[PDB]
Curated annotation (Swiss-Prot):
Keywords for this protein: Calcium, Disulfide bond, Hydrolase, Metal-binding, Protease, Serine protease, Signal, Zymogen
Entry binding sites for Ca(2+) 1: 175, 177, 200
GO cellular component term of the entry, any: extracellular region
Span within the parent record: 106 to 383 of 384
Catalytic activity: Hydrolysis of keratin, and of other proteins with subtilisin-like specificity. Hydrolyzes peptide amides
Keyword Transferase part of the UniProt annotation: no
Cofactor needs: Ca(2+)
Gene field: PROK
Family from the record: Belongs to the peptidase S8 family.
Identification of the protein by name: Proteinase K
Cysteine pairs bridged by disulfides in the record: 34-123, 178-249
Length: 278
């Protein structure tokens, strides 16, 4: 398949080079896979989801996304126009309030939920979790993200937007998950993007067009935008049978575009997510 005039991030992960506008992908598009979007929620009624999005859990008064962050990241995972895996199933786990903030205990509980809730869902091609959140270091949050990963869920987490080493941020510093940094449309590390030895992959994260609450769309920047790219790419690759949840992060690094990014500090991976579609 080919999407003409695609968001630059979608075209980027389907090309060996920057500057292209067409998103090439296999028509399977991640059908049969599930991606849990643990964030502010998902506006499931958004036409771009085509009924493939549902809210499964909320830790606040309402399951509605009053912020728009989670609907945006869920759109980057599997929206029709703005999604990597355009036929995946999207599950919304609202752990952040409508301010985009959330206590660590709630975030841990949200990850514990996805580890159990997945086994009462039909996801024959695997389960992915996209987590565009995080604060300072916390071994309890790292342990939770590791539990979700070990339960059989491909966990993609954001490296953080502090322009610092991700070693001091959770769940970014949990080694067993997929820590995702951000790159811009000219293959530079995003100005804000965290780095460090714990990063496993870089995704498009600067000015990412995706869906928004109110049936709308808008472009925002952050490692929060690069995470759903990798989460969608993993579900796309697991539907193709090229990898499993336990190995999708290692596979994406094995087949990533190597050495293309700039302002990557020494000791940080120069790998950009790539679907190798031909
Ligand atoms: Ca890792």
């Amino acid at each position: 398949a080919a999407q003409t005039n695609a968001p630059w991030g979608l075209a980027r992960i389907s090309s060996t080079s920057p500057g292209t506008s067409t998103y090439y992908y296999d028509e399977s598009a991640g059908q049969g896979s599930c991606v849990y979007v643990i964030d502010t929620g998902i506006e499931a009624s958004h036409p771009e989801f085509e009924g493939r999005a549902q809210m499964v859990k909320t830790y606040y008064y309402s399951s509605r996304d009053g912020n728009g962050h989670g609907t945006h990241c869920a759109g980057t995972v599997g929206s029709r126009t703005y999604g990597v895996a355009k036929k995946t199933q999207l599950f919304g786990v609202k752990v952040l309030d409508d301010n985009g903030s959330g206590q660590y205990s709630t975030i841990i509980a949200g990850m514990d939920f996805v580890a159990s809730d997945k086994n009462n869902r039909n996801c024959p091609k695997g389960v992915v979790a996209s987590l565009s959140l995080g604060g300072g270091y916390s071994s309890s949050v790292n342990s939770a993200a590791a539990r979700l990963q070990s339960s059989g869920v491909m966990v993609a987490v954001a490296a953080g937007n502090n322009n610092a080493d991700a070693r001091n941020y959770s769940p970014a510093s949990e080694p067993s998950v997929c820590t995702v940094g951000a790159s811009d449309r000219y293959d530079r590390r995003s100005s804000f993007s965290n780095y460090g030895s714990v990063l496993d992959i870089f995704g498009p994260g600067t000015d990412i067009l995706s869906t928004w609450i109110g049936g709308s769309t808008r472009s925002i920047s952050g490692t929060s935008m690069a995470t759903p790219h990798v989460a969608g790419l993993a579900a796309y690759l697991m539907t193709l049978g090229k990898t499993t949840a336990a190995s999708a992060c290692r596979y994406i690094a094995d087949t990533a575009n190597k050495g293309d990014l700039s302002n990557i500090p020494f000791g940080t991976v120069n790998l950009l997510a790539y679907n190798n579609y031909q």
